[PDB]
Design a binder for this molecule. Sequence first.
Ligand code: CL
Length: 151
Amino acid sequence: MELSLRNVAKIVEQIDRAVYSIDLAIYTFTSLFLADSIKRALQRGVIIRIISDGEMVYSKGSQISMLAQLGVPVRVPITTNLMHNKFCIIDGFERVEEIRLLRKLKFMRPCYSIVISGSVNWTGNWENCIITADDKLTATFQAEFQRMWRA
Ligand SMILES: [Cl-]
């Protein structure tokens, strides 16, 4: 239970350093530490999207409603949302590039894609956490995120 504290700390820190975008796919979202980092990211101008489960979104105590009220778009598949892992994409290449077109930015702040992944908890735990900056893995996660976002 100590590694989960260390891992969450590293994840919050990664979210704090998000420049343009955060795409999060999670089964249950109860971590106050994660939810607050998303808050600070949103206040920092970062565009954030969240994909979760319809039933778990209204469970106790979910942080989804608190984030959705701040203007964070949340989409849930129906039904239900079964995943093999929860993941977070920070400044994914394709996602940042599409933001470039949306805001029509003349200049780009330097950044790079970071993928955080871990085991799904069905019942604030981040077990089997991996943090890496490989675009090969990034593009795959982004593609999966794009798919669920459509549906
Ligand atoms: Cl989860």
